[PDB]
């Protein structure tokens, strides 16, 4: 199937920080890529769709970009409430696939 | 009668007006309508009639259980009065077999039916109500052909067959018949990876066929066949408006000489009129099924690898089921240009609607207009709850 | 307010069958493809299939074209998923989600249920 | 074949002899008769056949529930052998749509079918079994036409359409076709307030149409159309013998240039032969419904605002149901005068007989005699209790 390569399942950062998550697709998905945030309980929320479109009521700080096989989510000012796992996904063709995910953490002493 | 000649060109297509619709399944629940599939329409110098692969059983009889199966010795190619339903009492068997095509060269009709077991199939070519030529299998693996009318120029009727793998390379040939006789044949060339279920139209002494790449393409192979020189060519619709199905979502740019990847080992018979800015594509609405149908103006869809729709027209809502579709034209209608036409086999029953044990269909066809007519939706119209 | 309400957890004996209730409220049920997804350790997130209430259309992840049979009750506005022949490996979390493109297969899964955790044990 | 020509005049009408009657609903309960409505009859140089708007379902099948509804994508104009019932197996689809008209100019037939949604309807004009012209909606509000045969003179076939309000002023046009092509058109003039469902006859190179003023008239608008000059005129039957329905009781004097008031936003298609003293009117017997039917001699009914019947002839008892009715004539019968003819659609089922879920009909037609024949009543003949 189209394999979704998400390289880095752990990203330490500090509140205030501009973090950037990257995603990879086996083949050229032509922008049909989305991003999901799964907060620690289980809530899977959608943020960006079709590479750059923010979903309804999604913080203006979240960015999404990338073309061809490489895409990326850019979180501007890391807030405590962003410490979740982000999953990229492609809907270019069936079946739909998801990357491995990337768990954001804090850099401390 | 002299042999026809692709003398004219296609008229400016601005709208698709309703042309025929036989509410076969509607009426079929209380009448003697034969179970069919793989329909199409063709015209002779004084009539246009529907055609299909009958299953040798009506819809309400017990012999309809199992009609999903598309190959048995109880299937014949039947023709019938434009827009009436294929009834036992009005249909006219044309030949025996489970894959066909038929064109009228001017003088008479040529019908071809393929029958036999998968590894041992044959195509008997009838010309004028009489069998005249036979062609045994070459790759011994489901010798199949067009499934829609063929086109002829000055006596020569090119026609496309395929014998082999339906999920890997195979062997297709362009046979050239005249009055039933094989004038020659040739293996497929051009850049088209796999060919299946070609929809051909004619205009300006050149035949154009849009087919099905079951193997790897979501875009579609095309075959520009020359009736006189008896050569041909192949490639793909450069357009990123993919028209096969299943199919991945629409890209920004498309492939011209190689298949568009994403989905493989599947597709549907479809068609298209490629006339420069005057080009329309037909496709299903769902990217995952044969539900809904639409027509779209995509100028230079054959050459431009970025071409996007500039006009449209729905035919079947997404919620309604479509199926195969193809082209045909009245090469005998009075006029200075050939009015492009097409039909969409509305499929009813299995595998989608499985409350019934049969699988059958009805036809809806349309032709072009130079007027910008308003659109209406054309569903099959039957209520599956009534056959329970 | 799209709301895809889904039970907390299912407990079933290995080898049995089970049904995933996915009661949807908040929009025209008949208008949006309903997807299902499995989230398990190792494999991660996986799409099972799609049920379109508008006309009953379904498609499955070829790797699940046995394990699952999609269906839905239009009256009660619920989508369903029955898993056949449960084993230890079936223990994961199943989510039903709505399509951003409605009948289309683009626009991502705009809305998700809370997730049903299925357990296979004795 | 040369184009016909309205060379003769109407013969002296003294009696109406029986001409056709297909006991469609009678036979229909145990045969494969299509559900219809809006019938009429027309003749070509060698045949006269029935025509109607099929509903794409037979009477006994489950798909007849809901046939009251007069507009859907499952309706086609079908023609059939004079006096036989419209059976799936013998009917012949003519075009797709839910409003029509058809005349034979001598050489070939012209059929027109209107289909589409209320705000986006179109009329594709077929001439000789092939579509040739299309006309999209102008007021985007139920583009509708005659519902009975049209008349042609030397190649020109005038025909009347209406697009707009069915309960307030609208836009009607008199299109003039030749071999399928639009030679011209023009907006309605004359004193007629509203035009709908025109019944036209020809004689003496001039066409006369009697229509339906749904808006305000209980009397009926008339349109004297000239096929050569391609002009036309309108007014109302001066006669106080009102022929529309519903309709107020008969007055002593009538209105000639304005609609007769009392009942509005309703009516029925009807007809009349206006030939000086040789003039007969047709009308329903009930002033409140389409029950019963009668013919009456009302001399100078078109000019005389006081004219009352001098002869009569019942056709359908008051207790029996009638419906639409119109004119037609065999412009090819050997003779020195055109024998006037007419048909009355006997409506069975909903909304009147609501023990059934369908709505359908049968035809009874008659032509004139110079003899003073005795009268008989001609009901549909079916027993509604049998379809329960
Ligand atoms: C003559 C005329 O006006 N025709 C238009 C027609 O008018 C009707 C009137 O509405 C009606 N009523 C009244 C009161 O007038 C009377 O009947 C009239 C005639 O029938 O209306 C239709 C319908 O809106 C219109 O068709 C559309 O045409 C679009 C062209 O538009 C523009 O460009 C023109 C010319 O330059 C310009 O004038 C305008 O300014 C522009 O708006 C065409 O784009 C539309 O088609 C897209 O949308 C459909 C849904 O509406 C899709 O199903 C269709 O496939 C297509 O969009 C898909 O594909 C494209 C191509 O890649 C993509 O861009 C989209 O994202 C979308 O893709 C997704 O859907 C596909 C299908 O499921 C998937 O396969 C794919 O992966 C994606 O998921 C429409 O044809 C007549 O022109
Ligand atoms: C050639 C011939 O003789 N024809 C007559 C026919 O003969 C048949 C024989 O009876 C039969 N048997 C035998 C043994 O011979 C064999 O078949 C023969 C031919 O079929 O018989 C009919 C029936 O009686 C007869 O028709 C009537 O004709 C009347 C003309 O009468 C006279 O004038 C002549 C000529 O000058 C003269 O010779 C006589 O001396 C006069 O009597 C005609 O008036 C009759 O029609 C009225 O009555 C009907 C009921 O019978 C109504 O339904 C009809 O509408 C009309 O009357 C309504 O309308 C008028 C006009 O405004 C009004 O005046 C009435 O008050 C009445 O109106 C009310 O009813 C309407 C309908 O419901 C309402 O809409 C309205 O508001 C009012 O409520 C009849 O046509 C053949 O000529
Ligand atoms: C054939 O169809 C019938 C009719 O519904 C069904 O009951 C029967 O089981 C079907 N055939 C088979 C082999 O199942
Ligand atoms: C038809 O077409 C060919 C084109 O080369 C031409 O040779 C021939 O003269 C034409 N034949 C008829 C029968 O019109
Ligand atoms: C359709 O007709 C049937 C048959 O008599 C009736 O019972 C049914 O209720 C009708 N349809 C509707 C929508 O009521
Ligand atoms: C028919 O009628 C017109 C009347 O002006 C006349 O010109 C023409 O000569 C006649 N045509 C035929 C074909 O009889
Ligand atoms: Ca394919
Ligand atoms: Ca009126």
| Ion ligand 7 residue ranges (Cβ < 5 Å) | B 213, 217, 244, 267
Question: How far apart are alpha carbons D214 and D237 in whole angstroms?
Answer: 15
Which helix (H) or strand (E) element contains residue B337? strand B337-338
Tokens of B248: 């991945």
Question: How far apart are alpha carbons B339 and B335 in whole angstroms?
Answer: 9
Burial B228-248 (b: 16+ CB within 10 A, else e): eeeebebbbbbbbbbbbbbbb
Q: Which string of DSSP letters, residue by residue, matches B136-151? A: E-SSSS--B--SS---
User: Three-class SS of residue B386?
Assistant: helix
Question: How far apart are alpha carbons C108 and A19 in whole angstroms?
Answer: 23
Tally of domains in chain C: 1
Q: Which of B84, B364, B361 is nearest to D89 (CA)?
A: B84
- Interchain CB contact of A67 with B (< 8 Å): no
Residue A36 near residue A89 (C-beta atoms within 8 A): yes
B56 annotated ligand-binding residue: no
Pairing mode, if any, of strands D291-297 and D280-283? Answer: antiparallel
Three-point CA angle D239, D242, D244, nearest 5° = 135
A chain contacts of residue B261, beta-carbon cutoff 8 Å: 27
| Number of the ligand closest to the Cα of B60 | 3
Count Cβ atoms below 10 Å from residue C80 Cβ, excluding itself.
18
Domain extent for C54: 1-122
Identify the DSSP state of B24: H
Question: How far apart are alpha carbons B23 and D57 in whole angstroms?
Answer: 8
For D90, nearest residue in chain B (alpha carbons): B90
Question: How far apart are alpha carbons D87 and D8 in whole angstroms?
Answer: 36
Nearest CA residue ID for atom 3, ligand 6: D154
Question: How far apart are alpha carbons D151 and D101 in whole angstroms?
Answer: 10
Binding-site residues from annotation of D for substrate: 37, 71, 196-197, 212, 290
Which helix (H) or strand (E) element contains residue B26? helix B24-28
Nearest 5°: phi and psi at B28? Answer: -50, -25
Q: Which residue blocks in chain D are alpha helix, DSSP H? A: 24-28
Residue D223 near residue D211 (C-beta atoms within 8 A): yes
Tell me, in angstroms, the distance from the centre of ligand 2 to residue D312's CA.
5
Which residue from B249, B289, B320 is facing C106, i.e. has the nearest CB?
B249
Q: Is the CB of D66 under 6 A from ligand 5?
A: no
Identify any residues that bridge with D361 across adjacent strands, giving them in sequence order.
D347
Report how far apart, in Å, the C-alpha atoms of B236 and of each of B217, B220, B222, B279, D175 are: 9, 5, 6, 15, 46
For B246, nearest residue in chain C (alpha carbons): C59
Distance between B51 CA and the closest CA of chain C, angstroms: 28
B chain contacts of residue D63, beta-carbon cutoff 8 Å: 26-27, 29-30, 382-383, 386
Q: What is the CA radius of gyration of chain C?
A: 14
User: Three-class SS of residue B64?
Assistant: helix
Cis? peptide before B351, omega within 30° of 0: yes
Identify the DSSP state of D354: T
| CATH assignment of the domain containing D122 | 2.120.10.10
For chain D, give percent helix, strand, coil, nearest 5.
5, 40, 55
- Interchain CB contact of B287 with C (< 8 Å): yes
Q: Which of C96, C105, C115, C120 is nearest to C13 (CA)?
A: C120
Tokens of D14: 């003294």
Distance between C45 CA and the closest CA of chain A, angstroms: 6
Tokens of D221: 């608008």
Residue B77 near residue B93 (C-beta atoms within 8 A): yes
Question: How far apart are alpha carbons D86 and D93 in whole angstroms?
Answer: 11
- Interchain CB contact of A17 with B (< 8 Å): no
Does the beta-carbon distance from A46 to C47 stay under 8 Å? Answer: no
Does the beta-carbon distance from B318 to C106 stay under 8 Å? Answer: no
Q: Which residue blocks in A19-102 are alpha helix, DSSP H? A: none
Burial D272-283 (b: 16+ CB within 10 A, else e): bbbbeebbbbbb
Dihedral (Cα; A26, A31, A32, A34), 10-degree rounding: 90
Does the beta-carbon distance from C105 to B353 stay under 8 Å? Answer: no
Q: Residue D49: CA atoms inside 13 Å, Cβ hemisphere, count? A: 22
Tell me, in angstroms, the distance from the centre of ligand 6 to residue D184's CA.
19
- In ligand 4, which atom is closest to the CA atom of B3? 13
Domains of chain A are 1-109 (2.60.40.10)
User: Cα D307 to the chain's mean position, in Å?
Assistant: 24
C chain contacts of residue B289, beta-carbon cutoff 8 Å: 57, 59
Three-state SS for D256-309 is CCCCCCCCCCCCCCCCEECCCCCCEEEECCCCCCCEEEEEEECCCCCCCCCCCC
Domain extent for D156: 1-388
Question: How far apart are alpha carbons D127 and D180 in whole angstroms?
Answer: 5
Q: Is the CB of D65 under 6 A from ligand 5?
A: yes
Q: Residue B50: CA atoms inside 13 Å, Cβ hemisphere, count? A: 35
Helices (H) then strands (E): counts for chain A: 0, 11
For B330, nearest residue in chain D (alpha carbons): D130
* Contacts with B350 (C-beta within 8 Å, 6 or more apart), sequence order: B67, B68, B356, B357, B358, B359
Q: Is B166 buried (19+), middle (13-18) or exposed (0-12) by CB count in 10 A? A: middle
- Interchain CB contact of B75 with D (< 8 Å): no
Residue B40 near residue B187 (C-beta atoms within 8 A): no
Please confirm, yes or no, whether B324 is among the known catalytic residues: yes
Tokens of D298: 């009302």
B191: left (phi over 0), alpha (psi -120 to 50) or beta: alpha
C chain contacts of residue B285, beta-carbon cutoff 8 Å: 103
Tell me, in angstroms, the distance from the centre of ligand 2 to residue D294's CA.
10
Q: Residue D385: CA atoms inside 13 Å, Cβ hemisphere, count? A: 0
Report how far apart, in Å, the C-alpha atoms of A92 and of each of A30, A31, B247, B260, D140 are: 7, 8, 9, 12, 40
Question: How far apart are alpha carbons D54 and D349 in whole angstroms?
Answer: 15
Nearest CA residue ID for atom 3, ligand 4: B154
Q: What is the CA radius of gyration of chain B?
A: 19
Q: In what order do the strands lie in the sheet with A19-25?
A: A4-5, A19-25, A70-75, A62-67
| Number of the ligand closest to the Cα of B246 | 7
| Number of the ligand closest to the Cα of D371 | 2
Question: How far apart are alpha carbons B102 and B152 in whole angstroms?
Answer: 10
Please confirm, yes or no, whether B338 is among the known catalytic residues: no
Question: How far apart are alpha carbons D384 and B153 in whole angstroms?
Answer: 58
Q: Is the CB of D3 under 6 A from ligand 6?
A: yes
Cis? peptide before A48, omega within 30° of 0: no
For B260, nearest residue in chain A (alpha carbons): A28
Q: In what order do the strands lie in the sheet with D206-210?
A: D199-203, D206-210, D221-226, D231-236
| CATH assignment of the domain containing C62 | 2.60.40.10
> Among all residues of D, which ones are annotated catalytic?
70, 324
Q: Which of D385, D388, D384, D380 is nearest to D23 (CA)?
A: D380
- Interchain CB contact of D135 with B (< 8 Å): yes
Count Cβ atoms below 10 Å from residue D324 Cβ, excluding itself.
24
Helices (H) then strands (E): counts for chain D: 1, 25
User: Three-class SS of residue D32?
Assistant: coil
Tally of domains in chain D: 1
Structural resolution in Å:
2.2
Question: How far apart are alpha carbons D124 and D95 in whole angstroms?
Answer: 8
Q: Is the CB of B155 under 6 A from ligand 4?
A: no
Question: How far apart are alpha carbons A20 and B382 in whole angstroms?
Answer: 55
Q: Residue D18: CA atoms inside 13 Å, Cβ hemisphere, count? A: 14
């Amino acid at each position: 199937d189209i394999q979704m390569t998400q390289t880095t399942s752990s990203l330490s950062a500090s509140l205030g920080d501009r973090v950037t998550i990257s995603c990879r697709a086996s083949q050229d998905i032509s922008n049909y890529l989305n991003w999901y945030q799964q907060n620690p309980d289980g809530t899977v929320k959608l943020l960006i769709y079709y590479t750059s479109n923010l979903h309804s009521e999604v913080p203006s700080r979240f960015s999404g970009s990338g073309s061809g096989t490489d895409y990326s989510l850019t979180i501007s000012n890391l807030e405590q409430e962003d410490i979740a796992t982000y999953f990229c996904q492609q809907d270019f063709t069936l079946p739909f696939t998801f990357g491995g995910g990337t768990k954001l953490e804090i850099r401390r002493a | 009668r002299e042999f026809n000649n692709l003398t004219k060109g296609l008229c400016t297509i601005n709208s698709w007006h309703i042309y025929g619709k036989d509410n076969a399944v509607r009426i079929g629940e209380d009448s003697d309508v034969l179970v069919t599939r793989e329909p199409y329409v063709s015209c002779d110098p004084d009539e246009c009639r529907f055609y299909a692969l009958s299953q040798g059983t009506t819809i309400r009889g017990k012999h309809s259980n199992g009609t999903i199966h598309d190959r048995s010795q109880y299937r014949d190619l039947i023709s019938w009065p434009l827009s009436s339903p294929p009834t036992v009492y009005n249909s006219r068997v044309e030949c025996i077999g489970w894959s066909s095509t038929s064109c009228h060269d001017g003088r008479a009709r040529m019908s071809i039916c393929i029958s036999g077991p998968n590894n041992n199939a044959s195509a008997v070519i009838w010309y004028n109500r009489r069998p005249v030529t036979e062609i045994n299998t070459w790759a011994r693996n489901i010798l199949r052909t067009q499934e829609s009318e063929c086109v002829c120029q000055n006596g020569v009727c090119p026609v496309v067959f395929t014998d082999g793998s339906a999920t890997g390379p195979a062997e297709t040939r362009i046979y050239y018949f005249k009055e039933g006789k094989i004038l020659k044949w040739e293996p497929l060339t051009g850049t088209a990876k796999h060919i299946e279920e070609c929809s051909c139209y004619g205009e300006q002494a050149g035949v154009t066929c849009t087919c099905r790449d079951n193997w790897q393409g979501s875009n579609r192979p095309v075959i520009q066949i020359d009736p006189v020189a008896m050569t041909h060519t192949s490639q793909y619709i450069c357009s990123p408006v993919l028209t096969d199905n299943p199919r991945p979502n629409d890209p920004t740019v498309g492939k011209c000489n190689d298949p568009y990847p994403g989905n493989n080992n599947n597709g549907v018979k479809g068609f298209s009129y490629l006339d420069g800015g005057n080009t329309w594509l037909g496709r299903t609405i769902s990217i995952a099924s044969r539900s809904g149908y639409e027509m779209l103006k995509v100028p230079n869809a054959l050459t431009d690898d970025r071409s996007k729709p500039t006009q449209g027209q729905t035919i079947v809502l997404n919620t309604d089921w479509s199926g195969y579709s193809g082209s045909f034209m009245d090469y005998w209608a009075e006029g200075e240009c050939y009015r492009a036409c097409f039909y969409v086999e509305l499929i009813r029953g299995r595998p989608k609607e499985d409350k019934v044990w049969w699988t059958s269909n009805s036809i809806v066809s349309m032709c072009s207009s130079t007027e910008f007519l308003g659109q209406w939706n054309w569903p099959d119209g039957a209520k599956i709850e009534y056959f329970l | 307010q799209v709301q895809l309400q889904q039970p907390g957890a299912e407990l079933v004996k290995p080898g049995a069958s089970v049904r995933m209730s996915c009661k949807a409220s908040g929009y025209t049920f008949t208008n949006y493809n309903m997807y299902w997804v499995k989230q398990s350790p190792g494999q991660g997130l996986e799409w099972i299939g799609i049920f379109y209430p508008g006309n009953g259309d379904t498609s499955y992840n070829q790797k699940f074209k046995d394990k699952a049979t999609l269906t839905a009750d239009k009256s009660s506005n619920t989508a369903y998923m029955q898993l056949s022949s449960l084993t230890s490996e079936d223990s994961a979390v199943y989510y039903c989600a709505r399509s951003g493109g409605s009948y289309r297969y683009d626009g991502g899964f705009d809305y998700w249920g809370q997730g049903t955790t299925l357990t296979v044990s004795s």
